[PDB]
């Protein structure tokens, strides 16, 4: 019975049981660490010129020399195809666990 | 910090021109997501 003996004899098994870093886990805690929120904003009115080339200019060049499109989709696709040989073989092993696993239990069956 | 608007200006309306038309391969990010 898949609801009478197994909850009978669990009565009789629970019976006889009547009678017998340290920043990475801190953090854990729940609060990544903030970072620099300065870039972003600025002011041309406000405090500090730095800012405006200590942080923008520099970096919105590497931007627009970063940002890109010469090779564009094809280098994109390429690694797309890497992600379907990397997929197959998983499934293969899938299948290699789900025969040897049956096989086992043909052998008990008999 | 008026040329830093000018670049401001015309980098980022390139970048957004670079991104749209990019459109962080989208279609390919949702085919490259989805597999993994």
Redesign the interface.
């Known amino acids: 019975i898949p609801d009478g003996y197994k909850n009978e004899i669990d009565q009789l098994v629970k019976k006889e049981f009547a009678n017998i870093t340290l920043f990475l886990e801190e953090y854990r805690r729940k609060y990544p660490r903030i970072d620099t929120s300065r870039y972003i904003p600025n002011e041309s009115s406000e405090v500090s010129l730095l800012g405006i080339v200590d942080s923008y200019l520099k970096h919105q060049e590497i931007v627009l020399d970063t940002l890109l499109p010469q090779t564009v989709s094809n280098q994109w696709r390429i690694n797309n195809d890497y992600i379907r040989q990397t997929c197959t073989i998983v499934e293969e092993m899938n299948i290699q666990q789900r025969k040897q696993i049956n096989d086992l239990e043909i052998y008990r069956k008999r | 910090?008026e040329?830093?608007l000018e670049?401001?200006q015309s980098?980022?309306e390139?970048?957004e021109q670079?991104?749209r038309?990019?459109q962080h391969?989208q279609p390919?990010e949702q085919?490259?997501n989805e597999?993994?």
């Open positions: 910090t040329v830093l670049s401001i980098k980022v390139s970048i670079l991104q038309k990019l391969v390919l085919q490259n597999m993994c």
